Design a protein around this ligand. Structure first.
Ligand SMILES: Nc1ncnc2c1ncn2[C@@H]1O[C@H](COP(=O)(O)OP(=O)(O)OP(=O)(O)O)[C@@H](O)[C@H]1O
Ligand SMILES: Nc1ncnc2c1ncn2[C@@H]1O[C@H](COP(=O)(O)OP(=O)(O)O)[C@@H](O)[C@H]1O
Ligand SMILES: Nc1ncnc2c1ncn2[C@@H]1O[C@H](COP(=O)(O)OP(=O)(O)O)[C@@H](O)[C@H]1O
Ligand SMILES: Nc1ncnc2c1ncn2[C@@H]1O[C@H](COP(=O)(O)OP(=O)(O)O)[C@@H](O)[C@H]1O
Ligand SMILES: [Mg+2]
Lengths: 188, 404, 212, 228, 239, 248, 375
C-alpha cells in the first residue's frame, strides 16, 4: 500500500516538518486523521511507522478500553491522555477500532474541538467497518480526510511476503509471484 | 481535474518565500531573536522567588520565638485506651500514637487522672510519652465547615405570605431555646423535628436562613448530597460525628436541605442500587430518635418531595411537625413585592397590588427575579431610579416568556 | 437466645429495648446497623466479633441491634461479609455462652434468608399499630406530666385517632401542649387534643372525585 | 406504572389518564358562564400568525342553534368530539323530532370519551364547555377527558385556567345578568392572556333563552372593545 | 411515561410521538403557497435533480381534482399514498353524492385520515405536510395546510419548517392586506419567496398556478427564469 | 434506543428501520440500469460464482414478467421472490380489468405503495429489496425505473444499486452518454462499470447476468445474454483497454 | 506575563517598527548592569535551622499551638512561631516545620489538587470580542448579566439589585456559544473555570455531586471567577443512574443559589437542546437569563470570513457575498473548516494564495459531510 503513506505524511508528517507553510498561508493546522479499511492490514503498522519518522511520542489505545461500558472513567480518562501528551510535545495520539458510551463520545468531540495545535499534537483514530457513527465524526475541526486501506493487490501481496521473506531461507527456485496469486482478496 | 501529489522539499524552500520576500526574512529573524532574548532575560533575572513569605516584619521574631523553640516540648498526638487502674495510685494508661505505635504510659504530675477519660485524643511528650495535655476530639474535617459559623443577612421580615408557617416554625425551633420557662412550667416537652415541604422556589431555604440568623445558638447546615460518599459506610460515620459535634454545643440546630437526596424510601426489588445511601439514611433515623436520647438538638428539614421520604424518617418524634408551603396568594404576592422592592431604588408610587394580581401562581422566586429584571430594565437605560414601567415590562418578560 | 422486634415505625420497639436496658441491671450493648458497615475490608467483621467478645467478657450481657436491616439486607459484598460474621457470632461454636441479643427492624422483608432463622432469633415479636384501648393508655402515659383538664375522654381520642401509631399519639399530646401555649392557656382541655389530632392525622388529601 | 390505561396505580388512580388531564393545561384557556339572562362562552386566541384565517381555529363551534360549545385541547380530538356531538344531536332530532337537551348531549358525547381502555385506545386530550338554552332554561356544562361532566354556573378551562377560575369565583354569583358576566370574563381574559383585547386575539359566543340561535359574535365585539 | 408508544401521554400531557412526526416534516424541504387576488400560486424548490435522475418522476405537484392539487413535503411514499387517497375520495364523492365536491370536504377528509392513522398503535402516522388550494369557495380562492398531527387550518399564505424559518417570516413582514395585484403580482410574490428560499437558480424550481376560475396551470422553466430575472431587476432598481 | 419498531418516531425524526433496510441493499448486489438508446438493458453480477451452484433457471438475478417488462433483483431473496410474484399478479389484474398492458410507472408506483403500507403498520417489516425494471408502453415508451424499500420509485437515465454503488454512479456521471447512446455503447459502459466496481481483472462471464429489451423488433422482445456473447464483450473490453495502453 | 500584540498581522514595516520597539525595550531590560554594580534574615532563618520539613496541619488549638501531621502520617502537637501568617494557616494546608522540634515556621505555596489545577483553565487570552462576528444581542445581554456585574457592581450596589446568579446559553452547535463566554473571561479579569457536563457524570456513588461542590469551592477562593458548564443537558433533561443524576442536578441548584452565600462567582451554562432540560434549569427564578444563539445570517457570516480570512493571502476574484447567499446553512465552526479546507485546497493547488474557486471547492466538501434522510 502506497497511497496511505502519502496522505498520512501530508496530514501528519508534513504538519510536523514545515509549520511555517501553514502560518504563512494563514490556516489553522490540520487536527485529526481517520482511517478506513479492514482491521489492521497496515492500520497500526502505518501509525507506528510515521511516529518513528517524526520521532514524536506515540500513544496506543485499543478500542476495548474505549468502551469500558460501565461509565468507567470515559469522562476524564480522555483528558488524562491528552494532558500527558501536551506535556511530552510533540506527540502523536493513536486509537484503533472505534467501532468496538455516547457521553464520552461527546467528551472527545469537545476536546477535539478545544485543544490547541500549538504543540504538533494530532489524533489518528482508526476503524475497521463502515459504521453510521463514522460518517458523523467527519466534522469541522475534528478530521480532515478519508484515507482508505484496500485489500492488497497481487504484486502488493508479494511485497508483503518479501517483507518477512528476508529472514526465511529458500530452495533453489522459490517463485513468490506464483504463490502470491493464490489468495485473491486476502488481507495483509 | 488531474491527479496530483504532495509538495517536494525542493519546492517548499521557494514556495514559502517566492512572493513573500519583502520583509519575511527580517520579520522572522526579529521574532525568533525576540523569543530567545526573552528566555535570556528570564534566566538572567534568575528563578522568581517562590518564597511563601512570613508575617509582616514589625510583628514577629522577638527573643520569645527562640525561647519557646528551646524550651517547649514537641508533644506527640495519640489515642488513650482502657485505663488500667489496677492499683489506683498510678493507674497506667495505654495510648496509640496513630501511624507510629502503642504504649503503656503514665501522666505528667501536672495533669490529674480525673482529667483523663477513655480515648480522649491525648497528646504526649516525645521522650517517655507521658500524658502531658488533653486535646479536643478530632471532628472530621468535611464535617467542620458544615458548621455555618456566620449568620445570613435575612430576617423573618424578608419572608412574606408565610406568616403562619414562620409562626409555627418559631414556635417549634426558636421559642423553646429563647423561652424554655414557658414549656416546663406548663409541663410539656416541646417538639424537636420539623419538615418543610412545598413546590420548588416556595421559600423554604429562606426560612432556614432566617432561622439561622435569629438562632443565637449553634447552627449547622446540611445539603442532602453532602452525606453521599463513595466509600461504604462513610456517610453514616459522617452523620455520627455530625450529631456528636452538635451534642458538644449548649443546644444546637441542625438543618438538612433537600433531604430527598438520601431520604428515599427503602426498596429491594432492584437487588442493589442505592442501599449504600439507605444505610446512611438509617444511621440518620437512629440518630434522631433511638437509644441515647438526642438531647437539645433541634432538626430543621426542608425538601421538595415529602411523599418520597421513608416513613420511618417521616415518623413524628424525628419530624415532629410538618409545615406546608404553598404558592403565594394575592396578599402573599403583594407582601413579597413589598419585601423585595423595598431595598431597590424605585419611586414610592408603584401599584404593587396591580403587579401581584397581574402575577399568576408564579412562585416567590419569580417575584424576586421579576424585581431584579425590572432593575435590569432600568439599568439598560442607565436610569438611577427604576420605574413602574420597568416592573411591568419585567412581568411580561419573565412570566410570559416562560408561559409562551 | 435471640429476640427480634419488628413492626411499623412508631409502635415503640426502641422504647421497649430502652426499658429492657433500664430494668435488667445487666451489661447492655446498644448499636445500630450502620455502626457496623465501615469501609475497610474486614473492619465490620472485627467490630461484630469484638463486640461479641466484650459481651462475653462482661458475662451476663445483652446486645441490642437497632435497624438491623442496615446489615441485615438480603443476600456490596462487604456488608454481606459483615452480616455473615454476625450470624456466625450469633450461632457460635459453644453457642451464645450467656449473651442475649435483641434486634429491632421496621422492614422484615429485607432481612429474609438466614438472619430470621429460628436458631439465631428464637422469638419474633410483632409490634402492631396501637389498639384503641392501647391508644387511650398511650395518651394517658404522655399526658401524665402535662397537667391536662380532667374532663377529657381519652376513649374519644382513641376513636378519633384511627391508624395512629404510638409516636403519632405522643406527637398528638405534644401538639395539644403547644396549642395550649398558643392560646396561652393555664391548662389544656379536650378541644386542644382535638386540634392536635387534626394537625397530626394526615395531609387530608385533595378533592377525591376530580381525580383520574 | 405508565404503560397503559388498563393498569391500576398503587393508590387506585391511573397514571395514564391523569396525564390526559395534564394535556388540558397545554391548551388555550376558555371561559364559560351560565346566567339567567343567557349563556356565554369566551375563548382566547393568542394570534399565531397574521396569515392565518382567525376563524379557522375551531375552539368556538356550534353543534346546534339552541346550544353552544367551546374547546381547550388538541384541536384534532377536539374536532372529533365536535363531530360526534353534531351527529348525536342530529340523530336525536331525526328520531324524536325535537332538540337534544344539552345534558343529554354531554352524557352521550361522554360514551365516546369512555373508549380509552374499555372496548375490546387513549383518552382525548380535550376538555370542553357546553352552553345550552332549552327545556331547563340556560345551562352551562363542563366535561373532561376522564369522562366526568358537571353542570356549571361558570367555568374556566385551559392554560392559566386556575387564576381565571379563582378570580371568577371571587366575582361571579349565580344571579347575575348576562352582560356583567361577559364583562367579568372579558376583564379576566384581558388580564391573563396577552394585552388589550380585540377580535384578533379573543373570541366570544353567547346564546340566550329568547334567542336560541347565533351564539357566535362577529365584529359586534366592537362594543366590547369600546366598553372594556 | 415516555415517548416509546403512540398512544401514551407524557406525564405533563404531551404526545412526543406526534411532535416527532411534525419534526420529521420539519426536516422536509421548502413548501410555500399563497392565494392572490383570484389565483392560488405555489412554487416547488430544492428538487436538485442531479443529471442522471429525471425530473419527470419527481412529481413536483399532483392534482387531486381540477380545483385542488398537492405535493407534500417529507416522505414521498406517504405523500403518494395520501395523494391516491385524496384523489379517490374526491372523485368518488363527486360521482356518488347527489351534489359535487368542494375543497372543504376533502380538507376534512385528509385531516381525518391523518388523525385516524395517528390514533392507534401498530400504525405509523404520515410524516408529511401539504398546503391545500381550493377554487370553489363559491368561486373564491382559499388556502389550507395539513399536518401529521391530523391538523389543518386556513391561511392567506402558509409555509412549513425548512421554508418557514426564513420564507414565512419574510412573508409575514411583506404580506400586504391588499391581495397581490393580479396573478402577475401573485407570481411576483411567489418568486420573491423563492428568492428568500435557498438557491433560486432555476435548475429545479418549478411552479403551478391555479386561478380559482380556470383550472390548474403548470409553469415552464423559461417563464420561471424570466420572472426570477424580473424580480432581480426590481430589486436592482430598489436602491 | 429508538430503532426497535418501524412504527415509532425518534427524537430526531428519522426512521432507523428504513435506513437499516437501505443499508441492507447497501451490500445486496451491484445491479445497474444502463443509459441507452434503441434498446434498454440491465446488468447484474452474482455473488454466487461457484463450481457447484447449478443456476438451473439459467437466471437468478433477472426475472421477466411481460412481453415488454423485465426486472433485475438485488436484496433479500425471499422478499425478492414474493415481490416479483406480486408484480406478476398486479400485471395480471391490470390486464384482466383493462385488457391493456399496464403503464410501467403505474405498476412500479403500485408496488411502492404496497411496500410503504408494509412498512407503515405494526408487526410488519420493510421489504429489504431494491429491484430495477424496464418497459415500453404507449405513454412514454422506453422507461427505466428503480424502487426502494421505503416505497419510493426512482426514475433514472442510468442508475446502479447494491454494493459499491458510489463508484458506479460517479463513473456513470463521468462516462455519461446522451441521445445517440446506442445499445452497444451501453454494453461497453456496463462492461467498464462492472469491471471497476468488481475487484476482478478480466471480468469472467459467469459472474455477470445481463438482459435487455429491443424495439427494432417493435412487436417488442426481451433477451437474456448467454455466455458466449458476454465473453465476446469481455474480449472487446480487453482489446479496448489494450489499445488505451497503446495510446501512451 | 506576556508581551503586547502587534497591531497589523500583515507583512509590513509598521510591524517591523513595533517589533523593533519591543526589541529596544527588551534590550534596555537586559539585568547585567545591576548585576555588575540582615537582622531579619539572620535571626529567623537561624530559628528555622536547615533542613526544613513540610507537614500537613489540620488544627489550630491556640493562636500559638496546633496539631501538625507529617508525610509518614504521625501527628504532632506543636507550637507556632510569631512569623507564621495566622490567616494563611488553615486545615488541609501544607506547613513548614523545624527539623528538630517540629515547630510551625511558616506557610507554603499550595501545590496540589491536580484535577482543579486542570479546572482553572488559562486566562483564555486567545479569545477576544474582536474574534466574534456580530452577536450583538447576545453580547449586550451577556454584558448585562455577566461582564457588568463583575466590572461595575456600582449600579447594582446603588440601585439595590442582587445581580443575576446564572445564565444559560442555547443554540445549534458551532454557533459560537463557548467562544463568547471564553471571550468574556478575557474581557473581564475574572478567572475562567470550564467544565463539560458529560465529564461530571462519575462512576462512583457520590463523586459526581462532590465535583460540583469541588468546582464551586474552587470558584470561591479565586473570588472574581467564571464557571462554564458546557453541554449542560447531560445532567439536566427529564426523567441506578436515574437517582444520582437527579442528586447531581440538585447539587447545582444548591450551589447556583440555595443556602449560605455565593460570593461573586458567576455561572454560565451552554447546551444545544434547551427544549429538553429540566424546568428547574428553565426555572426563571433559578436561572435569570437564557440567551439565544441563532444560526448566523448574511451579515454575521460576512464578518466570520473577515475574521477567519484575515490571515491568508487572497486573490481579487474572491466573492464572499456569493458564498453567503444560500441560507444560514452552516455555523461559524463550519466556516472555520471553510477557511481551513480552502487553505488546504489552495495549498493542494501549489499556490500560497487562495482564490474564489478554492472557496467553492471549500464549500462543497463541507456540504457532503452532512447526513442523508427523507428522500
Ligand atoms: N407502646 C408504647 N408506649 C409508650 N410510648 C410508645 C409506645 N409506642 C411508641 N411510643 C412512643 O414512640 C416514641 C419513639 O418511637 P419508638 O422508636 O420507640 O418506636 P418504633 O416503632 O420502634 O420506631 P423506630 O423503629 O423508628 O425506632 C417514644 O417517645 C414513645 O413515647
Ligand atoms: N501491508 C502490510 N505489509 C506487511 N505487513 C503487514 C501489512 N499489513 C499488516 N501487516 C502485518 O500486521 C501487523 C501489524 O498490525 P496491523 O495489522 O497493521 O494492525 P492491527 O494491529 O490493528 O492488526 C504486522 O505484524 C504486519 O506483519
Ligand atoms: N414567601 C416568600 N417571602 C419572601 N421571599 C421569597 C418567598 N418565597 C420565595 N422568595 C424568594 O425566592 C427565593 C426562594 O428560595 P427557596 O425557595 O428558599 O429555595 P429552595 O428551593 O432551597 O427552597 C428566596 O431567595 C426569596 O428571596
Ligand atoms: N459568531 C462567531 N464569531 C466568531 N467565531 C465563531 C462564531 N461562530 C462560530 N465561530 C467559530 O466556532 C468556534 C466556537 O464554537 P462553539 O459554538 O463555541 O462550540 P459549541 O457549539 O460546542 O459551544 C470558534 O472556534 C469560532 O472560530
Ligand atoms: Mg428504632
Amino acid at each position: 500500500l502506497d497511497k496511505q503513506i502519502k496522505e498520512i505524511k501530508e496530514v501528519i508528517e508534513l504538519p510536523v516538518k514545515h509549520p511555517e507553510l501553514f502560518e504563512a498561508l494563514g490556516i489553522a493546522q490540520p487536527k485529526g486523521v481517520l482511517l478506513y479499511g479492514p482491521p489492521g492490514t497496515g492500520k497500526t503498522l502505518l501509525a507506528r511507522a510515521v511516529a518513528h519518522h517524526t520521532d514524536c511520542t506515540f500513544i496506543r489505545v485499543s478500542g476495548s478500553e474505549l468502551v469500558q461500558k460501565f461509565i468507567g472513567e470515559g469522562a476524564r480518562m480522555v483528558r488524562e491522555l491528552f494532558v500527558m501528551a501536551r506535556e511530552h510535545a510533540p506527540s502523536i495520539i493513536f486509537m484503533d477500532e472505534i467501532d468496538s458510551v455516547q457521553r464520552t463520545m461527546l467528551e472527545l468531540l469537545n476536546q477535539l474541538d478545544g485543544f490547541e495545535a500549538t504543540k504538533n499534537i494530532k489524533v489518528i483514530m482508526a476503524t475497521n467497518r463502515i459504521d453510521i457513527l463514522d460518517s458523523a465524526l467527519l466534522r469541522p475541526g475534528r478530521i480532515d480526510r478519508k484515507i482508505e486501506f484496500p485489500p492488497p493487490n497481487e504484486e502488493a501481496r508479494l511485497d508483503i511476503l518479501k517483507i518477512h521473506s528476508r529472514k526465511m531461507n529458500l530452495t533453489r527456485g522459490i517463485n513468490l509471484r506464483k504463490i502470491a496469486e493464490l489468495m485473491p482478496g486476502a488481507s495483509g | 481535474d488531474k491527479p496530483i501529489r504532495a509538495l517536494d522539499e525542493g519546492d517548499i524552500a521557494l514556495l514559502k518565500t517566492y512572493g513573500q520576500s519583502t520583509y519575511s526574512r527580517q520579520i522572522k529573524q526579529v521574532e525568533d531573536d525576540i523569543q530567545q532574548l526573552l528566555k535570556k532575560i528570564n534566566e538572567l533575572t534568575g528563578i522568581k522567588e517562590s518564597d511563601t513569605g512570613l508575617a509582616p516584619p514589625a510583628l514577629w521574631d522577638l527573643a520569645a520565638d527562640k525561647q519557646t523553640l528551646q524550651s517547649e516540648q514537641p508533644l506527640q498526638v495519640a489515642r488513650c485506651t482502657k485505663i488500667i487502674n489496677a492499683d489506683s495510685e498510678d493507674p497506667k494508661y495505654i495510648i496509640n500514637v496513630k501511624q507510629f505505635a502503642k504504649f503503656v504510659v503514665d501522666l505528667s504530675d501536672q495533669v490529674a487522672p480525673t482529667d483523663i477519660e477513655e480515648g480522649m485524643r491525648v497528646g504526649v511528650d516525645r521522650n517517655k510519652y507521658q500524658i502531658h495535655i488533653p486535646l479536643p476530639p478530632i471532628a472530621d474535617p468535611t464535617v467542620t465547615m458544615m458548621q455555618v459559623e456566620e449568620k445570613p443577612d435575612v430576617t423573618y421580615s424578608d419572608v412574606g405570605g408565610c406568616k403562619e408557617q414562620i409562626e409555627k416554625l418559631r414556635e417549634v425551633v426558636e421559642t423553646p431555646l429563647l423561652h424554655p420557662e414557658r414549656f416546663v412550667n406548663l409541663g410539656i416537652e416541646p417538639p424537636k423535628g420539623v419538615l418543610l415541604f412545598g413546590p420548588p422556589g416556595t421559600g423554604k431555604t429562606l426560612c432556614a436562613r432566617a432561622v439561622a440568623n435569629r438562632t443565637d445558638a449553634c447552627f449547622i447546615r446540611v445539603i442532602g448530597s453532602e452525606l453521599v460518599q463513595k466509600y461504604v459506610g462513610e456517610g453514616a460515620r459522617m452523620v455520627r460525628e455530625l450529631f456528636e459535634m452538635a451534642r458538644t454545643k449548649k443546644a444546637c440546630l441542625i438543618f438538612f436541605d433537600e433531604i430527598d437526596a438520601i431520604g428515599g424510601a427503602r426498596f429491594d426489588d432492584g437487588a442493589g442500587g442505592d442501599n449504600e445511601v439507605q444505610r446512611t439514611m438509617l444511621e440518620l433515623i437512629n440518630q434522631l430518635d433511638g437509644f441515647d436520647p438526642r438531647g437539645n438538638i433541634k432538626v430543621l428539614m426542608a425538601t421538595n418531595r415529602p411523599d418520597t421520604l421513608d416513613p420511618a424518617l417521616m415518623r413524628p418524634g424525628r419530624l415532629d411537625r410538618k409545615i406546608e408551603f404553598s404558592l403565594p396568594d394575592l396578599e402573599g404576592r403583594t407582601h413579597i413585592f413589598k419585601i423585595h422592592a423595598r431595598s431597590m431604588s424605585v419611586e414610592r408610587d408603584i401599584r404593587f397590588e396591580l403587579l401581584a394580581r397581574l402575577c399568576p401562581n408564579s412562585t416567590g422566586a419569580e417575584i424576586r427575579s421579576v424585581c431584579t429584571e425590572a432593575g435590569m430594565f432600568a439599568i439598560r437605560a442607565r436610569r438611577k431610579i427604576a420605574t413602574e414601567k420597568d416592573f411591568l415590562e419585567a412581568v411580561n418578560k419573565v412570566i410570559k416568556s416562560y408561559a409562551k | 437466645k435471640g429476640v427480634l422486634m419488628y413492626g411499623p415505625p412508631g409502635t415503640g420497639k426502641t422504647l421497649l429495648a430502652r426499658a429492657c436496658a433500664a430494668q435488667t441491671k445487666a451489661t447492655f450493648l446498644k448499636l445500630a446497623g450502620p455502626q457496623l458497615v465501615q469501609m475497610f475490608i474486614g473492619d465490620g467483621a472485627k467490630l461484630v466479633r469484638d463486640a461479641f467478645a466484650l459481651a462475653k467478657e462482661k458475662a451476663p450481657s445483652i446486645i441490642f441491634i437497632d435497624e438491623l436491616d442496615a446489615i441485615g439486607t438480603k443476600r456490596d459484598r462487604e456488608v454481606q461479609r459483615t452480616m455473615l460474621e454476625l450470624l456466625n457470632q450469633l450461632d457460635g461454636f459453644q453457642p451464645n455462652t450467656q449473651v442475649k441479643v435483641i434486634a429491632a427492624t421496621n422492614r422484615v422483608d429485607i432481612l429474609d434468608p438466614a438472619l430470621l432463622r429460628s436458631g439465631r432469633l428464637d422469638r419474633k415479636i410483632e409490634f402492631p399499630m396501637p389498639n384503641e384501648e392501647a391508644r387511650a393508655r398511650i395518651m394517658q402515659i404522655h399526658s401524665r406530666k402535662m397537667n391536662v383538664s380532667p374532663d377529657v375522654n381519652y376513649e374519644e381520642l382513641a376513636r378519633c385517632t384511627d391508624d395512629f401509631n404510638g409516636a403519632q399519639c405522643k406527637a398528638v399530646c405534644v401538639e395539644a401542649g403547644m396549642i395550649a401555649l398558643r392560646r396561652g392557656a393555664t391548662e389544656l382541655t379536650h378541644e386542644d387534643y382535638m386540634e392536635g389530632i387534626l394537625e397530626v392525622q394526615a395531609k387530608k388529601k385533595a378533592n377525591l372525585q376530580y381525580y383520574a | 406504572y405508565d404503560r397503559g390505561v388498563n393498569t391500576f396505580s398503587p393508590e387506585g388512580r391511573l397514571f395514564q389518564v391523569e396525564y390526559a388531564i395534564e394535556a388540558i393545561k397545554l391548551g388555550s384557556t376558555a371561559i364559560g358562564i351560565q346566567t339567567s339572562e343567557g349563556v356565554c362562552l369566551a375563548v382566547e386566541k393568542r394570534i399565531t400568525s397574521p396569515l392565518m384565517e382567525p376563524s379557522s381555529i375551531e375552539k368556538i363551534v356550534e353543534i346546534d342553534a339552541h346550544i353552544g360549545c367551546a374547546m381547550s385541547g388538541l384541536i384534532a380530538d377536539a374536532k372529533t368530539l365536535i363531530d360526534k356531538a353534531r351527529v348525536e344531536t342530529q340523530n336525536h332530532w331525526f328520531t324524536y323530532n325535537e332538540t337534544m337537551t344539552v345534558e343529554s348531549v354531554t352524557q352521550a358525547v361522554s360514551n365516546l370519551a369512555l373508549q380509552f381502555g374499555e372496548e375490546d385506545s387513549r383518552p382525548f386530550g380535550v376538555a370542553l364547555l357546553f352552553g345550552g338554552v332549552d327545556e331547563k332554561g340556560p345551562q352551562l356544562f363542563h366535561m373532561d377527558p376522564s369522562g366526568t361532566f358537571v353542570q356549571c354556573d361558570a367555568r374556566a378551562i385551559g392554560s392559566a385556567s386556575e387564576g381565571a377560575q379563582s378570580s371568577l369565583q371571587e366575582v361571579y354569583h349565580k344571579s347575575m345578568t348576562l352582560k356583567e358576566a361577559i364583562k367579568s370574563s372579558l376583564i379576566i381574559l384581558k388580564q391573563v392572556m396577552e394585552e388589550k383585547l380585540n377580535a384578533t386575539n379573543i373570541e366570544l359566543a353567547t346564546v340566550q333563552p329568547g334567542q336560541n340561535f347565533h351564539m357566535f359574535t362577529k365584529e359586534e365585539l366592537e362594543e366590547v372593545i369600546k366598553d372594556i | 411515561s415516555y415517548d416509546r408508544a403512540i398512544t401514551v401521554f407524557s406525564p405533563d400531557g404531551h404526545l412526543f410521538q406526534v411532535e416527532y412526526a411534525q419534526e420529521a416534516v420539519k426536516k422536509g424541504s421548502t413548501a410555500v403557497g399563497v392565494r392572490g387576488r383570484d389565483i392560488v400560486v405555489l412554487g416547488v424548490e430544492k428538487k436538485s435533480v442531479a443529471k442522471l435522475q429525471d425530473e419527470r418522476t419527481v412529481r413536483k405537484i399532483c392534482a387531486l381534482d381540477d380545483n385542488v392539487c398537492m405535493a407534500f413535503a417529507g416522505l414521498t411514499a406517504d405523500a403518494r399514498i395520501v395523494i391516491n387517497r385524496a384523489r379517490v375520495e374526491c372523485q368518488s364523492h363527486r360521482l356518488t353524492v347527489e351534489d359535487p365536491v368542494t375543497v372543504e370536504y376533502i380538507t376534512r377528509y385528509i385531516a381525518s385520515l391523518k388523525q385516524r392513522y395517528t390514533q392507534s398503535n401498530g400504525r405509523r402516522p404520515f410524516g408529511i405536510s401539504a398546503l391545500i388550494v381550493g377554487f370553489d369557495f363559491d368561486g373564491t380562492p382559499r388556502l389550507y395546510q395539513t399536518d401529521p398531527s391530523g391538523t389543518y387550518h386556513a391561511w392567506k399564505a402558509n409555509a412549513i419548517g425548512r421554508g418557514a424559518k426564513s420564507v414565512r417570516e419574510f412573508l409575514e413582514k411583506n404580506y400586504t392586506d391588499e391581495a397581490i395585484e393580479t396573478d402577475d403580482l401573485t407570481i411576483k410574490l411567489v418568486i420573491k419567496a423563492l428568492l428568500e428560499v435557498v438557491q433560486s437558480g432555476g435548475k429545479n424550481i418549478e411552479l403551478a398556478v391555479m386561478r380559482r376560475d380556470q383550472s390548474l396551470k403548470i409553469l415552464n422553466p423559461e417563464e420561471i427564469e424570466k420572472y426570477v430575472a424580473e424580480i432581480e431587476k426590481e430589486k436592482e432598481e430598489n436602491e | 434506543r429508538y430503532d426497535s419498531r418501524t412504527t415509532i418516531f425518534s427524537p430526531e425524526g428519522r426512521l432507523y428501520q428504513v435506513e437499516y433496510a437501505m443499508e441492507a441493499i447497501g451490500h445486496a448486489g451491484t445491479c445497474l440500469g444502463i443509459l441507452a438508446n434503441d434498446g434498454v438493458l440491465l446488468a447484474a453480477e452474482r455473488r454466487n460464482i461457484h463450481k457447484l451452484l447449478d443456476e438451473v433457471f439459467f437466471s437468478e438475478k433477472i426475472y421477466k414478467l411481460n412481453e415488454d417488462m423485465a426486472c433485475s433483483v438485488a436484496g433479500i431473496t425471499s422478499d425478492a421472490n414474493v415481490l416479483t410474484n406480486e408484480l406478476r399478479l398486479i400485471a395480471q389484474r391490470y390486464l384482466l380489468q383493462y385488457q391493456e398492458p399496464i403503464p410501467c410507472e403505474q405498476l412500479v408506483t403500485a408496488l411502492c405503495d404496497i411496500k410503504q403500507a408494509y412498512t407503515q403498520f405494526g408487526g410488519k417489516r420493510p421489504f429489504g429489496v431494491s429491484l430495477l425494471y424496464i418497459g415500453w408502453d404507449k405513454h412514454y415508451g422506453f422507461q427505466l425505473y428503480q424502487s426502494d424499500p421505503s416505497g419510493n420509485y426512482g426514475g433514472w437515465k442510468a442508475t446502479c444499486i447494491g454494493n459499491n454503488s458510489a463508484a458506479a454512479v460517479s463513473m456513470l456521471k463521468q462516462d455519461y452518454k446522451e441521445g445517440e447512446m446506442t445499445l452497444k455503447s451501453a454494453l461497453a459502459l456496463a462492461i467498464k462499470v462492472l469491471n471497476k466496481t468488481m475487484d476482478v481483472s478480466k471480468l469472467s462471464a459467469e459472474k455477470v447476468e445481463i438482459a435487455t429489451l429491443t424495439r427494432e423488433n417493435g412487436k417488442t422482445v426481451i433477451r437474456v445474454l448467454k455466455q458466449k456473447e458476454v465473453e465476446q464483450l469481455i474480449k472487446k473490453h480487453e482489446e479496448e483497454e489494450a489499445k488505451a495502453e497503446r495510446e501512451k | 506575563s506576556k508581551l503586547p500584540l502587534v497591531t497589523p498581522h500583515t507583512q509590513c514595516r509598521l510591524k517591523l517598527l513595533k517589533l523593533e520597539r519591543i526589541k529596544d525595550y527588551l534590550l534596555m531590560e537586559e539585568i547585567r548592569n545591576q548585576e555588575q554594580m540582615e537582622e531579619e534574615r539572620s535571626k529567623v532563618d537561624d530559628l528555622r535551622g536547615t533542613p526544613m520539613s513540610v507537614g500537613t496541619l489540620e488544627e489550630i488549638i491556640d493562636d500559638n499551638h496546633a496539631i501538625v501531621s507529617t508525610s509518614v502520617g504521625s501527628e504532632h502537637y506543636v507550637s507556632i512561631l510569631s512569623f507564621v501568617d495566622k490567616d494563611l494557616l488553615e486545615p488541609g494546608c501544607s506547613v513548614l516545620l523545624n527539623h528538630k522540634v517540629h515547630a510551625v515556621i511558616g506557610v507554603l505555596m499550595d501545590d496540589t489538587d491536580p484535577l482543579v489545577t486542570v479546572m482553572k483553565v488559562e486566562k483564555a487570552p486567545q479569545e477576544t470580542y474582536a474574534d466574534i462576528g456580530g452577536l450583538d444581542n447576545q453580547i449586550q445581554e451577556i454584558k448585562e448579566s455577566v461582564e457588568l456585574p463583575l466590572t461595575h457592581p456600582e449600579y447594582y450596589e446603588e440601585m439595590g439589585i442582587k445581580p443575576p446568579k446564572g445564565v444559560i446559553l442555547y443554540g445549534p452547535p458551532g454557533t459560537g456559544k463557548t467562544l463568547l463566554a471564553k471571550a468574556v473571561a478575557n474581557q473581564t479579569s475574572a478567572t475562567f473555570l470550564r467544565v463539560v457536563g458529560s465529564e461530571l457524570i462519575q462512576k462512583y456513588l457520590g463523586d459526581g455531586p462532590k465535583l460540583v461542590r469541588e468546582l464551586f469551592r474552587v470558584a470561591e477562593e479565586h473570588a472574581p471567577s467564571i464557571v462554564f458548564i458546557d453541554e449542560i443537558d447531560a445532567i439536566g433533561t427529564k426523567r441506578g443512574g436515574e437517582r444520582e443524576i437527579q442528586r447531581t442536578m440538585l447539587e447545582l441548584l444548591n450551589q447556583l443559589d440555595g443556602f449560605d452565600s455565593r460570593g461573586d462567582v458567576k455561572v454560565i451554562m451552554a447546551t444545544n437542546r434547551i427544549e429538553t432540560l429540566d424546568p428547574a434549569l428553565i426555572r426563571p427564578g433559578r436561572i435569570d437569563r437564557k440567551i439565544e444563539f441563532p444560526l448566523p445570517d448574511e451579515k454575521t457570516k460576512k464578518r466570520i470570513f473577515q475574521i477567519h480570512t484575515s490571515r491568508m493571502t487572497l486573490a481579487d476574484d474572491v466573492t464572499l457575498d456569493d458564498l453567503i447567499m444560500a441560507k444560514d446553512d452552516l455555523s461559524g465552526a463550519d466556516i472555520k473548516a471553510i477557511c481551513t479546507e480552502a487553505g488546504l485546497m489552495a495549498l493542494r493547488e501549489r499556490r500560497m494564495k487562495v482564490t474564489n474557486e478554492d472557496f467553492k471547492k471549500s464549500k462543497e466538501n463541507v456540504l457532503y459531510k452532512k447526513q442523508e434522510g427523507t428522500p
